[PDB]
Amino acid sequence: PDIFNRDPRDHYDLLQRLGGGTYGEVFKARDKVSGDLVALKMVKMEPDDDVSTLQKEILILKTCRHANIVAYHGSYLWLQKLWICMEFCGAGSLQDIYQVTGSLSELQISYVCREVLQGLAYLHSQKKIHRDIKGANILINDAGEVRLADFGISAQIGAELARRLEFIGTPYWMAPEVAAVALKGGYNELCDIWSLGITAIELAELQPPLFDVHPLRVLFLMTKSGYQPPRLKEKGKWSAAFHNFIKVTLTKSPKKRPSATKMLSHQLVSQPGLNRGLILDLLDKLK
Numbered sequence: 001p002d003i004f005n006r007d008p009r010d011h012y013d014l015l016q017r018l019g020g021g022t023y024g025e026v027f028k029a030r031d032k033v034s035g036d037l038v039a040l041k042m043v044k045m046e047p048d049d050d051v052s053t054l055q056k057e058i059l060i061l062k063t064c065r066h067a068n069i070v071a072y073h074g075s076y077l078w079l080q081k082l083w084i085c086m087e088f089c090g091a092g093s094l095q096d097i098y099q100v101t102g103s104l105s106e107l108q109i110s111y112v113c114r115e116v117l118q119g120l121a122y123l124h125s126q127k128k129i130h131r132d133i134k135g136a137n138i139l140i141n142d143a144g145e146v147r148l149a150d151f152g153i154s155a156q157i158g159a160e161l162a163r164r165l166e167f168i169g170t171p172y173w174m175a176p177e178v179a180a181v182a183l184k185g186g187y188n189e190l191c192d193i194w195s196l197g198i199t200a201i202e203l204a205e206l207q208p209p210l211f212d213v214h215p216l217r218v219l220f221l222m223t224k225s226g227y228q229p230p231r232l233k234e235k236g237k238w239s240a241a242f243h244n245f246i247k248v249t250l251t252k253s254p255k256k257r258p259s260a261t262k263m264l265s266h267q268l269v270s271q272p273g274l275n276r277g278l279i280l281d282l283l284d285k286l287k
């Protein structure tokens, strides 16, 4: 991986701050030479972070190539800050969209779900796990296409890495099985299938299930043996294929939850007629 050792402002003009967090901030930028629009995610480094770890992580981003994953262009390391240059999606997230447009149509939701599963199937083929499939992390470009955003690299380096370690506290007395669960272990890639189920409900009802319930309470309720998976509120508004798509994605047992590849063969996402034009209608609603 070629982490360019220059200033990113030499090659790009920053145009607008899109969002931020403990990882850093993301800007809309324009290539001073190409004129192409790009997203520039700046991750604030820490002294104890090693240059070896970044390369490992930048190779992960470089190798990960799928049409439904936001494209990686390059990386820069300047003044103790890391900059990741990525594909730019001019319509923001689906959350940015449905907060203005309202609930999506079943056809639009199906197209989104098929596109996400295509990317999800690719990530799981590479033994990777998104971990945060949700409407706020599903990007849309002006062409009506779907791109998965990923904030994982920040959990392995920089300030987010520090804050997690700050919460775990001292690990020297910890048993090795507890250590595993702290490095995000204990589950499988099939949690992405569940999160897509809630996302479909989120796109249909403008909120995830139990959104108005306190986070702790919601956490207890899912660990109860008698928990019931959520469902769409208005049954009549949606077809049986959609209801079944929600039923099979929201399988409690991870050993019985179907894979992204199995879900790509589901009736809701395998129907002809699903294409970018469905979201082009949505982006027009916004206008």
Ligand SMILES: COc1cc2c(cc1Nc1ncc3c(N)cc(=O)n(Cc4ccccc4C(F)(F)F)c3n1)CN(C)CC2
Residues within 6 Å of the ligand: 018, 019, 020, 025, 026, 039, 041, 070, 071, 086, 087, 088, 089, 090, 091, 092, 093, 096, 136, 137, 138, 139, 149
């Ligand atoms: C019109 O364009 C945009 C309008 C808005 C957003 C995004 C873009 N466009 C874009 N395109 C490509 C990428 C990319 N490859 C990686 C990446 O992290 N982001 C940022 C992002 C991505 C997902 C969630 C949060 C965030 C953020 F951090 F910014 F808050 C990208 N954003 C985010 N809404 C909250 C506010 C409005």
